[PDB]
Symmetry: C5
């Protein structure tokens, strides 16, 4: 899957359908994987740099692949 | 959903029906989403500023949407 | 439910039946709610002040309601 | 159950059958309770002193009772 | 099982099939154990030294055994 954005996690949002939105770079993206919820929040809290991989590389787009650096 | 309150998390409470109550701004609110329990506690512990979105914007009211900043 | 004890968590104990015991104030109490295990450990580790609410307010008594301050 | 060892968690090990091994005092012990995995890793990380209770107080022996101090 | 690599966790990656990849030493490896996801991310965040034990000791190989030092 292609790289989409890389950056620190500007903010996260828990959504009304139990998905989890994230803002990284200039993109707001979401993931239906519940596993990623607390990893992403930890990244946000500790100031990790993450890379998100997705073909739906647009605001509102979905993702499931993330790299924690 | 409309913004309801924004602030740091004043306190949380685990309830007898496994719901989780949170005090943010001047509102005490609850969420039946189990997934939010540890996110909300981490936010509380680290001093994050959260925004809760809900149409039931009164003490005792329910929520599922939260933004972690 | 009435207040039972208020204090920092002196120590916790994982029990052989997968319940979790906590010492707060002068009381040892337990909870069969798995969700509370890591919340109570976190409170212990970070020195949070908790309040436990239970009508079984004696050593060995059960609880499910906790306030995290 | 009798006390078996007391000390800081020298190391943990995740095992091929999803059990979790821990080195405390002079004993290596394991637990088949999944709930304890992240508690024991948090105790290791923050330098908590634990006591493990078990009748199988020998290397390789099993446990489910832990006290977090 | 034989030792494979030892080191700090250079990066992790959540994969599209809910497995978790990890870079330690000169090897990129994955595990299908969901339990290990947040343990390995904690090790990464806190700068723990891990050892991975696997007979598939090449890039892209699988593991389930980790030692946290
Ligand atoms: C005032 C003293 O009494 C109480 O405070 N009682 C609290 C308990 C009863 N709670 C309750 O009924 O919650 C459900 C109704 O509340 C949810 C609210 O529903 C809206 C509905 O969607 C609207 O279209 C309609 O006009 O009215 C009601 C209320 O204004 O919606 C909000 C979000 O917009 C909450 O739902 C969210 O939280 C709960 C709990 O976490 C639940 O998951 C929902 O799935 C989630 O959306 C209110 O609870
Ligand atoms: O031999 C067991 C196996 O033991 C594991 C152990 O859990 C770890 O400490 C170690 O590192 O790896 C050893 C070697 O395998 O555990 C599995 C299940 O988790 C099997 O255990 C069951 O088998 C027995 C037959 O009844 C007995 O009841 C065990 O106590 C069961 O749990 C395997 O046989
Ligand atoms: O392919 C497996 C690997 O299989 C071994 C098998 O263990 C040997 O007895 C055989 O002779 O050699 C094959 C090939 O290496 O087992 C390794 C660890 O020894 C990996 O297996 C683990 O990883 C998997 C995905 O993480 C899954 O968790 C397995 O259950 C683990 O055993 C490798 O993938
Ligand atoms: O028996 C349960 C409960 O019933 C009554 O309260 C009702 C709702 O439960 C309560 O949420 C609601 O609160 C109102 C405030 O009073 C109102 O001023 C504010 O604008 O919003 C909320 C919700 O719309 O009130 C109703 C009844 O009007 C009972 O009154 C209460 O004691 C409690 O027993
Ligand atoms: O976590 C793994 C395992 O831990 C606990 O069991 C311990 C040993 O695994 C087990 O073999 C041991 O059996 C005891 C009996 O209780 C006792 O009656 C008998 O006489 O002696 C044996 C061997 O010494 O018990 C210990 C701790 O008491 C846990 O209870 C168990 O379910 C399992 O998780
Ligand atoms: O410490 C908490 C808990 O962990 C251990 O059980 C594990 C999971 O927590 C549990 O939900 C899971 O149960 C399996 C059943 O064994 C199986 O019959 C069914 O088909 O699938 C479920 C859902 O996965 O199993 C694991 C352990 O294999 C621990 O043994 C348990 O008693 C308790 O302490
Ligand atoms: O919290 C999760 C769930 O765990 C188990 C208990 O028996 C329940 O009553 C409930 O707590």
């Amino acid at each position: 899957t292609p790289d989409c954005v890389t950056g620190k996690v500007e903010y996260t949002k828990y959504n009304d359908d139990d998905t989890f939105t994230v803002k990284v770079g200039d993109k707001e993206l979401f993931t239906n994987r519940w596993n990623l919820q607390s990893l992403l929040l930890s990244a946000q809290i500790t100031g990790m740099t993450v890379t998100i991989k997705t073909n739906a590389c647009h605001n509102g787009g979905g993702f499931s692949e993330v790299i924690f650096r």
